[PDB]
Symmetry: C3
Subunit: 268 residues, 3 copies
């Protein structure tokens, strides 16, 4: 019995994707989420859609309440969270329009809370050191990859996302430097989203859409065109991927995530 | 009608550079600037001088009000902001006493707001993703570069500045690490000043003065550097005032306005 | 005359270490330290033990009040602070159970104040730029190195620590990239602890105990490390007591004072 959190970023602020949709506002112990939860369905599978930046795209990446967002999805009984993110490419072979099913991340954020266990909440007591060797759910990633192959989508099977604080773009020096650190794509929103998802014991996976090369590489209209196409690629990828997920067993996987998440907490 | 904002850093807390000096505190939606603005002129060019750390150098770099400093200068009607910075050298060929007219930076700061568009000020609404592929004004830089040449100053034409949070200096491991990153010089104040200037649509350039090599390899050199930097400024500013800036300024403002996503 | 501050990290939250335990809760202009200072002696050397995370290990690395901790140890008269840290290893040659008398750090923290001189406390006036070229006391590190040999402990003589913000662990890609930066071991507590000890003019060194390989490549080896660290401390501290320091502290004290503008 699965329930799929879906976080929609840039170009997917308010996407018509769910059947039988209901609007639901919640509060959480970490504050309010970016916008109403959108309860709904794809084929037979229960989904919950949420606009990372709010449905009018009014919340900058530094100010996204990632804690509230993941907590609200957890609380609504989500088993998976699949997200999208418009990103810059740091690699010749990752072309504008390409999907990257990222497997790793490099944190360059500085102002964002990264744990539920901050010692200030009684819903999250103790000190948690969550493991990050494998931040993304490999089975959910496997299905995303398989399904994009089916759809005939240009797709990369792994990649390391460097997440910057923003809101500014990179400098050229930084773009070049990120390359030397082994980053493949860049954005402002993966961290700490992915980190909090692990703490919450939720299978998390990210659909990264390369909207353009970052400034290392030697037109707004071209970028907005790429971005709109990318959004439609991502929409089908989700529409086709989510029913595949709803047709396999997950209690196996989910028991191991819930355990890694409990076992990272140190009691007083 | 240019008007040059000038931000004095280490060694330039309280220089006497302007004619017809006048002084006033000013307010901004972002808080108090580091100190009173000093108004005055260099030849026929209107200038605004501001001490980055206060005139008594009382403000540490993580505590500098970058937003108010740049907003103040903008509201005063500045077209340009030319700044000095006392830096360390990460490169053998950038010798103590050299000037670097930097053209890139790497961010190592952790505590500083980098945008006016934080969602909480009526004067800056929207989400702004400002491009930083080319963070300093190349045209302002080019005049600085040419003027340094005419003055016979040891001057490098470009360089990448790594801005650390501070106020502590870098470990030796860190200094070596920054070299592997392609950093050329190191300081505490370039980020976010430079980012906020672009968001403001002001032409920004930075005269960086190597006081020493960083620890991978003070006071007297620092005094000589301020005097070279002051000379560069006195000679550059009348050149900026004698050339045309409308298209440059129009390109900056358009890029900035284009960066802003409204509801 | 010397007095040895001792900060105990993970596995050393409340060690049975000092002769004649006297419990002293203090306050500082930066807040309360993680817990009571424990006063005591080891072979006639005046010591002050402190639990980094509190005696029940309740405070996470990001929330440790490093300013209150260093300041309290300093007011107490400490000439030296020797600390323990439970770390990950980023090198094949640094195995679980090995000790590393670290000599460098790479800062990867984001949330943490790294100075006393913040312009808001009158006990610490002005702008201070503390040199960090040699963050750890070479004198104190040597004594620790010799003793560890004398004790039969696997021990590396130098090493660069990367201090990440946490509380999460590193991703693989971060862990590979730290190696290429030149880090050898990875923790969450060294920075700004080391930095504040320098400002304070106190001799600082750190016993880093590798509990595992970080993910580029358990609870048992931690308990064993704890023991090895206790030993190293019990034996190291009297050697320091029976050596001369006047010149070292003078130079530390002077560098600290000349860093303030």
């Amino acid at each position: 019995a699965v329930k799929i959190g879906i976080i929609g970023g840039t170009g997917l602020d308010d996407p018509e994707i769910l059947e039988g949709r209901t609007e639901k506002y919640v509060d959480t112990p970490f504050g309010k989420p970016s916008d109403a939860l959108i309860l709904g369905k794809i084929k037979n599978v229960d989904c919950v859609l949420l606009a990372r930046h709010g449905r009018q795209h009014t919340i900058m990446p530094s100010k996204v309440n990632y804690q509230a967002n993941i907590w609200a999805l957890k609380e609504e009984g989500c088993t998976h969270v699949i997200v999208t993110t418009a990103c810059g490419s740091l690699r010749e072979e990752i072309q504008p329009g390409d999907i990257v099913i990222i497997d790793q991340f490099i944190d360059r954020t500085t102002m964002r809370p990264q744990s539920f266990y901050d010692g200030s909440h009684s819903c999250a007591r103790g000190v948690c050191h969550i493991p990050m060797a494998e931040p993304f759910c490999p089975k959910t990633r496997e299905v995303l990859i398989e399904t994009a192959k089916k759809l005939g989508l240009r797709c990369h099977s792994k990649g390391t996302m460097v997440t910057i604080e923003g809101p500014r773009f990179s400098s050229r020096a930084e773009s070049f430097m990120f390359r030397t650190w082994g980053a493949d794509v860049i954005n402002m929103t993966t961290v700490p989203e992915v980190v909090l998802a692990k703490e919450a014991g939720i299978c998390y996976a990210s659909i990264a859409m390369a909207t353009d090369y970052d400034c290392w590489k030697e037109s707004v209209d071209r970028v907005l065109k790429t971005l709109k196409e990318n959004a439609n690629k991502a929409k089908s990828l989700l529409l086709t991927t989510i029913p595949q997920i709803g047709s396999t067993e997950w209690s196996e996987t989910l028991h191991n995530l819930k355990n890694m998440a409990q076992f990272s907490v140190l009691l007083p």
